[model samples]
Target chain A: DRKAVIKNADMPEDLQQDAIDCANQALEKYNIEKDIAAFIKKEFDRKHNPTWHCVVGRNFGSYVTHETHHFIYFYIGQVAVLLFKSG
Target chain B: DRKAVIKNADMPEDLQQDAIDCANQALEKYNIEKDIAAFIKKEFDRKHNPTWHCVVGRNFGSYVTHETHHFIYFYIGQVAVLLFKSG
Candidate 1:
């Protein structure tokens, strides 16, 4: 039953998919993108192209690729908040 | 296309499921279960119940529940290796 809850047939059964799910899920629930976008919107001196909030996404990736992966065995969700400035 | 691979209809599309996928994926690949189970097999003075090698699983969950979720937005797979000793 635990396994069932963990790896439902309908659910992703791999690391890559799971990572994406975490991102999309949090994005869906929090709707933080707009806030993130808003922050970027404010930071940008030019309103011509207002969609450059790669801060969280880039930082999350930085932690994920360098810091997190360095740990041989760790959780996928723990450091996820690094991606969101609001978080 | 990236999203396609990330959240296929057949694959899981949530954090919990993604976490399960990471665990199961490593477990399946390394067959570390046997090694982990074997480690338990040795550590246990009593052969009666030899299945307590929750090392990676426990630690991974530890980081996950304690550290990972603390991050409001982040990637999932990078830290997952912490769940597998072989990783």
Candidate 2:
């Protein structure tokens, strides 16, 4: 029930799995939204590239222009996660 | 009671007022989070420059890298709005 579920994505299969795994690991380590977001963002920036963004919460709506094939939105239990790359 | 209140900002005074006004106008015209966010973002992009981003909702936490002097987080009633420029 706590597995990461992809709500939407424009990323490759391998990278998408990587994102999900990173989020799960972040969730296991952090409880606050900012910490969770920061963990995932830093992991992505270090492993893949710079300028990755992350949003973590239970409720929110966002409008952003992300790099093509670098956007993902998912949920782990009740928390929603949005990760993307821009700039 | 519905006025835009700046919770945090890294923007100029005049531009800050412009952002608050744009948010108020958007709130007056739209009720959905996406619609409100889109309105504010489009207005900013047109009036200021391209590449503005917006997030609207009641609850959320985000980690993002924005252009200096181009980020603001505010509220109208209980709704939270995060606006920034990054590309």
Candidate 3:
């Protein structure tokens, strides 16, 4: 199963589950990593609020300061996804 | 030579040069990708502003909306670096 497992998160439980679901859907819908990130970001921007950012890939390191309770990092198989809000 | 090259940027020329220099210095100073990103992000936050973000890796994809004239993507050898400001 292509389920997203949280590595670290500062978000609410419901929001985290939403993010996981969105990510799984995105991975299924898009083959390119850019589109996968875009899909997740757009979904959060529309459903929650503006100013969402996402990164998806197998190998990367990032340092960011996001709004409180609005950051998550997870893995879907070998790929990693990071989603945050900063605005 | 471990020189940094701009892959894409929407920042000013001077800032772009500064970012490249910082990235090269960070790469030399840190072996870990997380530290490389942190070193660059901290330099920019201290020099320019307090809300800079950075990503460093060889394989990744991201979608972010940054403040105008503050987004850049570059490469130093096989590693890719993305720096931006959003605050």
Candidate 4:
């Protein structure tokens, strides 16, 4: 899967880790202090950021929306416009 | 922390290495000869063009859609990375 970050619905059905693997990215990026919190609080928009960039979010952006992106991927850049958010 | 790219200064203190950890991604991914120079010289995402996407910066815009909804981070496959700086 090239460690692709599948969306919630795009994620395979009836599998626990696939969703976990997909969602864990959000958990890791936000530093949510807990996994379940991130999963329930955020969505699959995150899991994709790291897989494509080969890096993770180390800082939190100010905007809540950007924070959501940072929460999901922990990143922002000018070239970011090129990126496609497969939400 | 899933190895994310953190741009200058927004990193954690006492753990300032966080920025280094984040920036090292450029060193690892760009294939620059001088690790330290690439580390120090290469600008992070000084992407050219407003609505353009080129792999490693060809000074243009052509952002392609990997998908409207999915993981959309960064990748440079002759299409979406950039490095157009004289600094």
Question: lDDT of each structure?
Answer: 0.27, 0.86, 0.91, 0.28
Give one digit per residue, the lDDT tens place, for model 1 in A1-87.
Answer: 011112111212353344334434444444443343234323331332222122222121121211222111112233222211111
Interface Cα RMSD, each model:
15.5, 1.6, 1.4, 14.8
As a whole number from 0 to 100, the lDDT of residue B41 in candidate 1 is: 24
Q: Model 2 chain A — which ten-residue stretch has the worst lDDT?
A: A1-10
Superposed model 1: Cα runs more than 4 Å off: A1-87, B1-13, B33-65, B68-87
Docking level of model 4? incorrect
Among these predicted structures, which one has the highest DockQ?
Answer: 3
- Alpha-carbon runs more than 4 Å astray in model 3: none
Residue by residue across A1-87, what tens digits does model 4's lDDT show?
A: 224343222222432343445435444454422332334233333443322211122211111111123223211222111122222
lDDT of 3 at A69: 96
Q: How far is candidate 4 from the true structure (C-alpha RMSD, Å)?
A: 16.8
Predicted structure with the largest lDDT when compared to the true one: 3
lDDT per residue for candidate 2 within A60-80, as digits (tens), equals 777777789999999888889
Residue A36 displacement (Å), model 2: 1.0
lDDT string, candidate 3, B3-38, tens digits: 777887899999998999999999999989989999
Predicted candidate 3 versus true structure: per-residue lDDT over A28-82, tens digit per residue: 8998999999999999999988889999999899998888899999999999999
Better of 1 and 4 by DockQ: 4
Q: Is candidate 1 or candidate 3 better by TM-score?
A: 3
The CAPRI quality class of candidate 3 comes to medium
- Per residue, candidate 4 scores C-alpha lDDT tens digits across B1-87 of 234332222212433342234334544564532342233222322221122111232222221222221112222232222221110
DockQ-best of 2 and 3: 3
DockQ list for all candidates: 0.02, 0.70, 0.78, 0.04
